[PDB]
């Protein structure tokens, strides 16, 4: 819906995804009921990267609509979830540099340099590679 330009239903759908990721667990291999998905749809790395993905995908829609405080909340949560992704940080530092640059920006530089892929499914890898911006490290060196 984002690519077709519909802010409302976009933030709606992102929110529904976010709900399902936190108010339910996928790794409930308590009762073996079928041919469940063994590997692709169980990986905790997939869960945390997807959480972060949908938070970012939402945060940018608050920005597109002009609701930067709500966007900020979503990017903060994404940072809390995957601090070694750096897609998060680009968006967070861009927002803080827009609104309140100095202290928080440097504070998150320090977090990055404290920080400084394993087995994701392919649909998630391609979604992340798709949304991310090319000018990340250049901005991350700013």
């Amino acid at each position: 819906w984002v690519q077709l330009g519909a802010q409302k239903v976009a933030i709606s759908e992102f929110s529904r995804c976010l709900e399902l990721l936190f108010r339910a667990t996928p790794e409930e291999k308590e009762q073996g009921a079928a041919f469940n998905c063994e590997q692709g749809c169980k990986s905790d790395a997939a869960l945390q990267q997807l959480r972060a993905a949908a938070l970012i995908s939402r945060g940018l829609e608050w920005v597109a609509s002009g609701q930067d405080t709500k966007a900020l909340q979503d990017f903060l949560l994404s940072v809390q979830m995957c601090p070694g992704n750096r897609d998060t940080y680009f968006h967070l530092l861009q927002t803080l540099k827009r609104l309140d640059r100095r202290d928080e920006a440097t504070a998150l530089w320090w977090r990055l340099e404290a920080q400084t892929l394993w087995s994701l499914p392919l649909y998630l890898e391609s979604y992340l590679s798709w949304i991310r911006p090319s000018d990340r490290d250049a901005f991350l060196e700013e």
Binding site: K8, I11, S12, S15, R16, L18, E19, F22, R23, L55, Q73, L77
Partner: protein, 340 residues
């Protein structure tokens, strides 16, 4: 009529100083004079106490007395509170003299001998003083026993029994000030609000707002006082339970829209956190999700004159904040969902 002014004011002065710890000069002479005056007043209340200019003249004198004193600073002396207390003024005085430790021994003896001669005068035409004091002790013990063996704090405060007596006292005190017309009720209510414990006062107000008339000028004054003073109404709608405020509002439509504004304002100052699936406030004194849900549920489970009003006030605040249809975005969506 004029003969009674110098009698009544003199009695009120003697009574007021009675409770005070200057009692050294008192004697059987003073006490006898006191009690004979009190007999005269008790007789007056009996004789021509109803339906005349005399009753209203005395009320005027009394209330003017109680407002020139007011009850601030120099002495919060009760005095005989109202025209009905004339019929038992003598008992009050006696009780006060029994409380004054500074009373001299011979005075005390003559006093107690005049209250309690014994059963030598068991046959008396007028219900005398000894019977009155025995009957007072009886009631007092009866009240204590009910409180500690039968009584239960009702949840529907309107139907409880302590609060409903306080309420009717407050209502009598508003009616008397209205007929007096000297100072406005707002002043009385403001003074009350500073002196005594506030949360108790507020509980009381809620219930006084619901008592049917006993002549609705009582409730009609309080609604105006409350809509004048927002801060109390801030703590009012914050302190009471749900169902009580629901019955209040259905009774007084004048209270509906502001109360909704109060609730609406508490909604708009929450924020959703995604990690725990619960709306929360930033500050601690911001009403939590549960309390706000409670109040709205009570408001919606009400007569239809209010159900449409609250429901429409909620939908207009939903559409105001983006017409989302999914939770995590709008407190107003989460309320309308947690209703079906």
């Amino acid at each position: 009529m004029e003969s009674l002014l110098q009698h009544l004011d003199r009695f009120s002065e003697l009574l007021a100083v009675s409770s005070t710890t200057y009692v050294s000069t008192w004697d059987p002479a003073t006490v006898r004079r006191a009690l004979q005056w009190a007999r005269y007043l008790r007789h007056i209340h009996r004789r021509f106490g109803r339906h005349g200019p005399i009753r209203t003249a005395l009320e005027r004198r009394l209330h003017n007395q109680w407002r020139q004193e007011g009850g601030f600073g120099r002495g919060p002396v009760p005095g005989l509170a109202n025209f009905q207390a004339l019929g038992h003024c003598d008992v009050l005085l006696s009780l006060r003299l029994l409380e004054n430790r500074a009373l001299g021994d011979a005075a005390r003896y003559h006093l107690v001998q005049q209250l309690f001669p014994g059963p030598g005068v068991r046959d008396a035409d007028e219900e005398t003083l000894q019977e009155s004091l025995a009957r007072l002790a009886r009631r007092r013990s009866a009240v204590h026993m009910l409180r500690f063996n039968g009584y239960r704090e009702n949840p529907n405060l309107q139907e409880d029994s302590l609060m409903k007596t306080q309420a009717e006292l407050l209502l009598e005190r508003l009616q008397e000030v209205g007929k007096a017309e000297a100072e406005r009720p707002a002043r009385f209510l403001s003074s009350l609000w500073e002196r005594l414990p506030q949360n108790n006062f507020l509980k009381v107000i809620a219930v006084a707002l619901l008592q049917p008339p006993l002549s609705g000028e009582g409730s009609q004054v309080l609604v105006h006082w409350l809509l004048g003073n927002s801060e109390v109404f801030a703590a009012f709608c914050r302190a009471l339970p749900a169902g009580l405020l629901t019955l209040v509002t259905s009774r007084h439509p004048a209270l509906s829209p502001v109360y909704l504004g109060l609730l609406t304002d508490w909604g708009q100052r929450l924020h959703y956190d995604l990690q725990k699936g619960i709306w929360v406030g930033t500050e601690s004194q911001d009403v939590p999700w549960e309390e706000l849900h409670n109040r709205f549920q009570s408001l919606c489970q009400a007569p239809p004159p209010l159900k449409d009003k609250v429901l429409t006030a909620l939908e207009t605040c939903k559409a105001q904040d983006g017409d989302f249809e999914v939770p995590g975005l709008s407190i107003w969506t989460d309320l309308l969902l947690a209703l079906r």
